[PDB]
Design an enzyme around this catalytic site. Sequence first.
Site, short mmCIF file in Angstrom:
data_model
loop_
_atom_site.label_atom_id
_atom_site.label_comp_id
_atom_site.label_asym_id
_atom_site.label_seq_id
_atom_site.Cartn_x
_atom_site.Cartn_y
_atom_site.Cartn_z
N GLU A 1 0.81 -1.22 0.00
CA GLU A 1 0.00 0.00 0.00
C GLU A 1 0.86 1.28 0.00
O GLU A 1 0.56 2.22 -0.71
CB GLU A 1 -0.97 -0.01 1.18
CG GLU A 1 -2.09 -1.07 1.08
CD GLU A 1 -3.18 -0.75 0.04
OE1 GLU A 1 -3.15 0.36 -0.47
OE2 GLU A 1 -3.99 -1.64 -0.33
N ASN B 1 -7.66 9.27 -5.54
CA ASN B 1 -8.50 8.34 -6.33
C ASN B 1 -9.28 9.06 -7.41
O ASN B 1 -9.45 10.27 -7.35
CB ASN B 1 -9.44 7.57 -5.42
CG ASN B 1 -8.68 6.84 -4.33
OD1 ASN B 1 -8.97 6.97 -3.13
ND2 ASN B 1 -7.70 6.10 -4.74
N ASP C 1 -12.43 9.14 -7.99
CA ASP C 1 -13.66 9.73 -7.49
C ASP C 1 -13.44 11.01 -6.68
O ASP C 1 -14.41 11.61 -6.23
CB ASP C 1 -14.46 8.71 -6.68
CG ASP C 1 -13.81 8.35 -5.36
OD1 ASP C 1 -12.70 8.80 -5.05
OD2 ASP C 1 -14.40 7.60 -4.60
N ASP D 1 -15.51 -4.69 9.26
CA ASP D 1 -16.67 -4.13 8.56
C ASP D 1 -17.45 -5.17 7.74
O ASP D 1 -18.53 -4.86 7.21
CB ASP D 1 -16.21 -3.01 7.62
CG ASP D 1 -17.33 -2.04 7.24
OD1 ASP D 1 -18.06 -1.53 8.13
OD2 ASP D 1 -17.48 -1.76 6.02
#
EC number: 3.2.1.17
Length: 129
Positions: free
Chosen positions: A35, A46, A48, A101
């Site tokens: 990462e 990103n 978006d 999650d």
Amino acid sequence: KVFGRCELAAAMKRHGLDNYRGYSLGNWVCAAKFESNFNTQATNRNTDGSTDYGILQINSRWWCNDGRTPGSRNLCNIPCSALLSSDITASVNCAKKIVSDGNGMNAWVAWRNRCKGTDVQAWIRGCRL
Ligand SMILES: [Pt+4]
Ligand SMILES: [Pt+4]
Ligand SMILES: [Pt+4]
């Protein structure tokens, strides 16, 4: 700060990530390697408009506030800048929420593509922990 492999393994272990939700330490160290290349200061934008932050590249769409991701959710309740610190506490506490999650470590695309189903123990080989 740019961590050494074993230095980071030790810090993650101290912060309770070894076997957290069933993921051995090597998985966490592998994810951090791919990462951020172990650099707590890594940021990546990103498509978006969201941004990924820190050692585990946690995303501002859901997890942290950076003041520039409209409709972001701030689930870890933390400015994203806190994730860039040389102290990994904030990143680790947020990663614990993320991995709980429902999708486990699949939330980290580099982990899915580059660590999942590999011999992840190699990442802690030879370290004093
Ligand atoms: Pt620490
Ligand atoms: Pt925001
Ligand atoms: Pt230790």
